[PDB]
Amino acid sequence: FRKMAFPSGKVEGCMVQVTCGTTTLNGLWLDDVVYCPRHVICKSNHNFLVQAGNVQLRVIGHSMQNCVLKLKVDTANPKTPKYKFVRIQPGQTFSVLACYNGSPSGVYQCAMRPNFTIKGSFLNGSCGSVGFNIDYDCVSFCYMHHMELPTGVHAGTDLEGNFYGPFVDRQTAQAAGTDTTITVNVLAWLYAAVINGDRWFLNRFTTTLNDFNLVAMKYNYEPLTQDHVDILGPLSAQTGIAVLDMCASLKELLQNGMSALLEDEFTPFDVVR
Amino acid sequence: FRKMAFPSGKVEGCMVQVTCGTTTLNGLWLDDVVYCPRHVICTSEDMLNPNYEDLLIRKSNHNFLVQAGNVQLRVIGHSMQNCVLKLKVDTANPKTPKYKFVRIQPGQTFSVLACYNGSPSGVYQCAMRPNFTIKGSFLNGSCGSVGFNIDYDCVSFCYMHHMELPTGVHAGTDLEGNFYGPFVDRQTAQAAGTDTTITVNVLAWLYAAVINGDRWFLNRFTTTLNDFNLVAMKYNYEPLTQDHVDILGPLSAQTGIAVLDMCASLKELLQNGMNGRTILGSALLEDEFTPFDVVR
Numbered sequence: 001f002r003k004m005a006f007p008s009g010k011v012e013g014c015m016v017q018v019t020c021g022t023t024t025l026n027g028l029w030l031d032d033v034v035y036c037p038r039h040v041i042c043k044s045n046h047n048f049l050v051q052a053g054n055v056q057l058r059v060i061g062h063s064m065q066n067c068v069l070k071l072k073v074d075t076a077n078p079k080t081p082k083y084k085f086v087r088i089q090p091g092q093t094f095s096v097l098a099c100y101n102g103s104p105s106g107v108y109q110c111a112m113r114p115n116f117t118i119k120g121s122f123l124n125g126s127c128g129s130v131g132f133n134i135d136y137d138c139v140s141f142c143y144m145h146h147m148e149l150p151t152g153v154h155a156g157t158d159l160e161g162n163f164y165g166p167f168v169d170r171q172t173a174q175a176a177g178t179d180t181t182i183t184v185n186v187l188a189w190l191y192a193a194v195i196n197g198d199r200w201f202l203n204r205f206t207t208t209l210n211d212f213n214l215v216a217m218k219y220n221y222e223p224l225t226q227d228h229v230d231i232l233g234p235l236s237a238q239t240g241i242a243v244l245d246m247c248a249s250l251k252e253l254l255q256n257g258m259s260a261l262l263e264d265e266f267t268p269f270d271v272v273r
Numbered sequence: 274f275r276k277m278a279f280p281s282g283k284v285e286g287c288m289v290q291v292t293c294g295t296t297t298l299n300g301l302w303l304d305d306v307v308y309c310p311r312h313v314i315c316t317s318e319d320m321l322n323p324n325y326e327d328l329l330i331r332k333s334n335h336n337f338l339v340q341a342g343n344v345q346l347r348v349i350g351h352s353m354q355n356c357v358l359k360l361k362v363d364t365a366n367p368k369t370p371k372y373k374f375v376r377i378q379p380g381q382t383f384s385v386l387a388c389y390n391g392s393p394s395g396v397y398q399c400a401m402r403p404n405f406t407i408k409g410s411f412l413n414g415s416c417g418s419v420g421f422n423i424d425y426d427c428v429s430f431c432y433m434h435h436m437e438l439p440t441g442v443h444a445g446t447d448l449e450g451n452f453y454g455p456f457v458d459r460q461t462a463q464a465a466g467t468d469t470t471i472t473v474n475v476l477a478w479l480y481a482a483v484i485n486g487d488r489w490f491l492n493r494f495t496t497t498l499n500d501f502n503l504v505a506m507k508y509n510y511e512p513l514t515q516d517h518v519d520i521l522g523p524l525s526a527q528t529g530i531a532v533l534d535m536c537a538s539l540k541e542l543l544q545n546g547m548n549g550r551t552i553l554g555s556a557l558l559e560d561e562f563t564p565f566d567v568v569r
């Protein structure tokens with residue numbers, strides 16, 4: 001199994017450079033609007049320098065929405081794809097197109113951690129890089145990168161500029177809470193191991209949701225929701241392994257050890273695809 | 274430090290769908306040539322002992338359905354170069370990036386754009402294993418998916434996917450149709466040689482661990498190159514060569530840690546384990562970053 005990112009092509013043709021005075025970051029150019037972190041003003045249209053490759057764009061209007069600055073420009077972006085702005089929940093996955101001063105640098109697959117950070121790894125100038133999912137040619141933009149937290153992880157907003165997690169776009173000491181493990185994603189990945197070839201970790205035992213959660217929380221694992229059980233029901237059908245018996249494999253796996261560590265960045269949806 | 278794949282847009286614009294009778298693969302449309310694996314001209318039978326020159330002489334331009342999205346391409350010429358089919362078409366590809374073909378060596382990295390039936394599905398980052406295989410993650414019909422690097426908007430194509438080995442790994446060719454490793458595009462009992470860790474990549478990754486925060490794995494010792502190899506090959510690590518030592522020289526300079534000291538560090542790590550500790554962001558020693566990657 002390899003984590004894969006979505007192909008980044010449709011998002012690549014939307015990335016511009018946005019410069020206000022001494023500060024430069026990335027922006028997202030959809031139709032005639034460029035989206036970027038409001039941090040770029042730390043005004044009337046003329047002091048916003050927006051470049052899409054070799055051209056310069058003329059800002060003809062500006063507007064804030066929460067922590068995102070909306071820059072209206074003279075031209076619509078002819079490379080605009082079909083797109084939605086969505087907000088994801090911890091444990092869901094998405095791809096990030098890291099950019100430096102407008103130029104897409106690389107792409108990687110993420111999970112929104114349960115403490116609302118992403119273990120990204122970032123170029124010096126990746127502010128305003130976006131995260132997205134693609135379904136049948138529709139880009140779901142779900143993340144705009146703002147900050148690195150002192151602990152090496154990253155914090156950002158949705159494309160309506162609402163922060164994920166208890167962070168502000170001021171230079172206050174802020175720290176991630178204790179990150180947990182995305183339990184429902186480990187289970188999907190253990191299903192994917194049996195749906196492939198691996199079934200040594202299976203056992204004849206089951207467990208209850210309550211007795212599993214007490215075991216789980218001590219190894220810093222997210223509690224498991226009766227909805228979490230439901231979502232993994234397709235995979236229980238495909239393999240013949242009930243969710244609470246895969247939990248017994250997981251409970252035992254949490255005490256004996258034996259990739260060689262348990263992956264938590266594949267959603268159940270990811271595994272079905 | 275997240276492994277990143279290259280932005281895939283320049284290769285997305287080149288993927289097509291190649292069909293021959295009942296066989297559909299991915300092809301690579303550059304200027305007015307579509308490249309794809311010659312296996313596309315095989316049938317039901319054929320797979321065990323195909324005679325590709327025989328099957329190809331029997332083919333006309335109009336037996337090849339080449340589709341780019343919703344547009345069918347007219348093939349106006351065909352030709353085999355090693356294990357790759359090359360179809361000449363009507364139209365140059367308008368989206369053709371600046372490109373070149375290169376052949377890579379074990380231990381070098383690249384991105385793979387995995388496609389089905391001509392549509393890109395995902396991109397991942399990759400190392401060519403020492404035994405000349407790939408640990409890919411391939412959907413059903415990813416064959417003809419290509420691998421590549423991008424440097425200053427120039428696309429170097431270096432891999433084309435052909436087959437999945439009985440052990441779960443993947444074999445392919447360069448874009449001139451010469452296989453990497455001792456494999457043939459043939460359904461016979463062929464096995465990957467024993468895979469080993471890319472030692473020069475772990476040491477580069479260890480230097481990247483020092484340039485960032487961590488020094489917890491360092492130690493007082495040093496080692497000779499020969500003594501290092503005798504220990505490491507007992508863990509299925511690739512022998513380090515003078516070339517590899519020379520290649521690590523730059524990172525040695527930036528850290529003031531000598532190459533053979535870093536080697537002594539790695540010896541101890543292989544002896545001890547992590548003790549549930551973490552180096553960059555991994556409980557595993559990571560061997561798919563090259564010395565070239567680490568600098569950038």
Ligand SMILES: CC(C)=CC[C@@H](O)C1=CC(=O)c2c(O)ccc(O)c2C1=O
Binds near residue numbers: 313416438458459
């Ligand atoms: C190589 C092996 C031990 C078994 C499969 C072999 O028959 C085969 C070779 C091949 O080259 C190929 C492609 O190139 C593309 C698709 C595809 O299924 C195939 C194949 O199955």
